[PDB]
Structure 1
């Protein structure tokens, strides 16, 4: 099997581990991988994809920079019998064959569940991510799925709901400060949607003497987030191991090149079709499993804690 991998952006740390695990795993399955990076550019990506189609790849793996505008290039690929796999970000209104990501709804469920595990009754502030980030709404659906029976039954009372523009720690800091002022510090848990916003909220909580007293969730397992969890000031984070995502995408890619129809958790609509999807299970990280998750995986080093 010939794989073309069109990564939007390899100039950052973002996708580089994904490339390397994907490449080494695909090769080990008996496949050749040609990789290009669009250096953040949407027109470079169109060209590199066209380049792949014209090299005779059997499978395209695309991490899109702008997934609203690859419809023609995908159609062109399908016309040649090439399979398209959308890696991590969905490709919209395109005739793709597969989608692999972590299950973002599950990220939300994990976040809210770790919080009702310790604060089954009390005042909750909802801190969503960017209101233009579709993933932000996904985390919030998962969070609300878990909260619903507690809200409807009066055990949990929602005392604010704000979305953090740009996921900026400093916007999250202001948001939190406003929520604390408006509730005269009576906030028992904060459903923050990532580590960076949680971190800004924690700074507001710290400045009122409430650090360690208010439950707060997160996501990404940022080093600093891992440290706050060890220190008691953040409750939990959700880890999304690259090696798992990259490993599973390679196996799907190879499967797709072999006419086979790979294992899909569900079917997401991209606004043209019901795309089969593997939505990997994300990992709850708390104070007790830091070593067994993010250290073991190599994501962070013990000497760094």
Structure 2
């Protein structure tokens, strides 16, 4: 037979990975492969055990979206010893030469888009400012978080340097703005304490949020101190993943933007890679320079993300079939 593919997803607490998993499995099975899809509920030891089982089971290919890829070094070595090819899915797996390919969206560009939605809304290109902004990052054990952050700062930093953007808290850098495990409650708490320490007098004009789940928590915090009223509008808040609650928030004129990353397209890239490996061919890659993982630069294929606001949500999210119309009502 064609062989089996082991698919390891990190959690279901962030909505996308259910879609990733469903789409990867649907497309792999259509392609004639057997699949073993597992979700780790954000438990690092359990994800490792799940991957060990796939290796022991003798899958031909592993597709892994890791909570913390650095913990997988030994199991990926074992996979390599058995001739199993490893595709890092969405998040780069670091500290392992046993990672063959990396399928993802253009993570730096995601950051550029997140920051640009904010700077465009604030009218910074038109010389407006100063405005107060606070920064959030993803989980520091997620290689993507650094790219989202760096991508955003490529747009933001020039305005911070010129004073047209002011980080009133002074908190910058992933070691200070990172949100462990991409946890909304954590981000909401940080927002609470940013507001009380730095914005009891002044107002926040924007918040760089790298993920929809965080955006919603950040917004709750802001409403907690009086934002989101007619007199006092919410600051401009970005996002990622186009989760339903965030899309509803955008439609309602609350959260400002998000980033659409079509998991159907990422699954398709993944199936193309699996097919190539099975056929003894080289997978198509479009970036062999960016994704250093500590041991090597993993050959990667990057998909182009799409910024979404209340202006384009229908065309981007509904007309293209990602969601049904009624899901957003």
What is the rounded CA distance, in whole Å, between the counterparts of 1:125 and 1:93 in structure 2?
Answer: 34
What is the rounded CA distance, in whole Å, between the counterparts of 1:48 and 1:76 in structure 2?
Answer: 11
Distance 1:8 1:290, change over 3 A: closer
TM-score of the aligned structures, taking structure 2 as reference length: 0.78
2:3 is aligned to: 2
2:70 is aligned to: 68
What is the rounded CA distance, in whole Å, between the counterparts of 1:67 and 1:213 in structure 2?
Answer: 36
Per the TM alignment, residue 211 of structure 1 is displaced from its structure 2 partner at its CA by 5.1
Per the TM alignment, residue 36 of structure 1 is displaced from its structure 2 partner at its CA by 4.4
**Which one of the candidate residues 282, 296, 299 is aligned to 1:273?**
296
Per the TM alignment, residue 130 of structure 1 is displaced from its structure 2 partner at its CA by 4.7
Which of 164-173 and 7-16 deviates more? Answer: 7-16
1:177 is aligned to: 195
Report the RMSD for the aligned CA atoms in angstroms: 2.8
Report 1:156-305 matches (<5 A): 156-160=165-169, 161=171, 163=177, 164=179, 166-168=183-185, 170-178=188-196, 181-182=199-200, 184-206=201-223, 207-208=226-227, 209=229, 212=233, 214-267=235-288, 268-304=291-327, 305=329
Per the TM alignment, residue 225 of structure 1 is displaced from its structure 2 partner at its CA by 1.4
What is the rounded CA distance, in whole Å, between the counterparts of 1:8 and 1:227 in structure 2?
Answer: 26
Q: Secondary structure at the residue paired with 2:58?
A: helix
1:47 is aligned to: 53
Deviations 1:80-109 (A, max 9, x none): 443221222333332121011223222211
Checking the alignment, whether the CA contact within 8 Å between 1:173 and 1:197 is kept in structure 2 is: no
Aligned: 1:143 with 2:149 = no
Aligned: 1:123 with 2:141 = no
Q: Secondary structure at the residue paired with 2:94?
A: coil
Unaligned runs of 5+ in 1: none
| Higher strand proportion | 1
Report 1:5-44 matches (<5 A): 5-8=6-9, 15-29=17-31, 31-37=32-38, 41=46, 42-44=48-50
Deviations 1:159-217 (A, max 9, x none): 233634533253144045236625x2333222122223322333344414465452221
> Matched residue pairs, number?
299
Unaligned runs of 5+ in 2: none
Deviations 1:103-128 (A, max 9, x none): 32222111110111121133232231
Q: Secondary structure at the residue paired with 1:271?
A: coil
What is the rounded CA distance, in whole Å, between the counterparts of 2:193 and 2:114 in structure 1?
Answer: 19
Deviations 1:42-76 (A, max 9, x none): 223212222125xxx2x332334552243343334
Per the TM alignment, residue 139 of structure 1 is displaced from its structure 2 partner at its CA by 1.8
1:132 is aligned to: 140
Distance 1:11 1:228, change over 3 A: closer
Q: Secondary structure at the residue paired with 1:187?
A: coil
Distance 1:45 1:111, change over 3 A: same
Deviations 1:256-304 (A, max 9, x none): 2222222223241222221111232222110111111222344433223
